[PDB]
């Protein structure tokens, strides 16, 4: 819902890759991370992350902060299927709840708690 990666990569190839990568790496989950629509915030050098399933949403959060080189004062929010995910969840749990039909998990990031 406003992911460029979906625009550029048709659904059947996506699903194919998601299936394969989950088979190959069942203790990891595949995540796509893009700036939210209308977000005013530093770029992420990379978009595709293969994340250990036991890493928490908090740890992945602080990981992404670091990659953006945010300053301490700078804010960052995650959105997944129109909710903010809880920091205590594991990326594995978040993936099982939220992955789309292409077997990827999509996370939108932004500077503001405003979304739509």
């Amino acid at each position: 819902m406003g992911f460029v990666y979906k625009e550029e990569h048709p659904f059947e190839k996506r699903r194919s890759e998601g299936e394969k990568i989950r088979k190959k790496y069942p203790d990891r989950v595949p995540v796509i991370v893009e700036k939210a629509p209308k977000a005013r915030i530093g770029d992420l050098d990379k978009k595709k992350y293969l994340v250990p399933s036991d890493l928490t949403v908090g740890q992945f959060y602080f990981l992404i902060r670091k990659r953006i080189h945010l300053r301490a004062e700078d804010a960052l929010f995650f959105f997944v299927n129109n909710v903010i995910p809880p920091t205590s969840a594991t990326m594995g749990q978040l993936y099982q709840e939220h992955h789309e039909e292409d077997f990827f998990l999509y996370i939108a990031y932004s500077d503001e708690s405003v979304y739509g």
Binding site: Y5, E8, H9, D45, K48, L50, P52, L55
Partner: peptide, 11 residues
Amino acid sequence: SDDDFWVRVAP
């Protein structure tokens, strides 16, 4: 915005 490869995150 680079989408060439998957970043293997350390456990």
